[PDB]
Every structure is written in C-alpha cells, then in structure tokens.
Design a protein around this nucleic acid. Structure first.
Ligand SMILES: [Zn+2]
Ligand SMILES: [Zn+2]
Length: 53
DNA sequence: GCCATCGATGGC
DNA sequence: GCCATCGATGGC
C-alpha cells in the first residue's frame, strides 16, 4: 500500500539510525512520538513525499 | 501483548 | 495543505 516492494528503499533491511524518524525510535533511545519508518526505507514510489530523505 | 508503521487529525 | 504528532491494527 505504501510499499512497492521493488525499490532500493523497500529492499533495505537496516535503519540508518540517524534520520529524525530513526532518532525517534525506542530502538534508538527516542520517545517514539513520530512513529514512522527510517527515511531511507520510505518506498521511493508509494511514500508520502515529505517522508522521503 | 508487543512491534512496526499505517491512516487520521488538530493546529498551523 | 502540511507537520508533528497520535490512535489503530496486522502480523508476530
Ligand atoms: Zn533512519
Ligand atoms: Zn518501494
């Protein structure tokens, strides 16, 4: 739905740990208030423009 | 029950 | 219409 399953972003399995969305994750100490995927993982086709890197 | 991440929403 | 959230839910 928000994933083509085919782009670089979709195939990627590892969070960058450095974008705002990563910083937000509990995985990375963040408060978990934004709740979105790594920016490098936002599908290049289907994502909200303003989620992309 | 938790996690990953989506759609929704209120403020701007 | 957009952002910064926040409620919701599929998949585990
Ligand atoms: Zn990231
Ligand atoms: Zn994709």
């Amino acid at each position: 739905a928000r994933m083509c399953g085919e782009c670089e972003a979709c195939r990627r399995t590892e969070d960058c740990g450095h974008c705002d969305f990563c910083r937000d994750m509990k995985k990375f100490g963040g408060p978990n208030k934004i709740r979105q995927k790594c920016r490098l993982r936002q599908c290049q086709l289907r994502a909200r423009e303003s989620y992309k890197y």
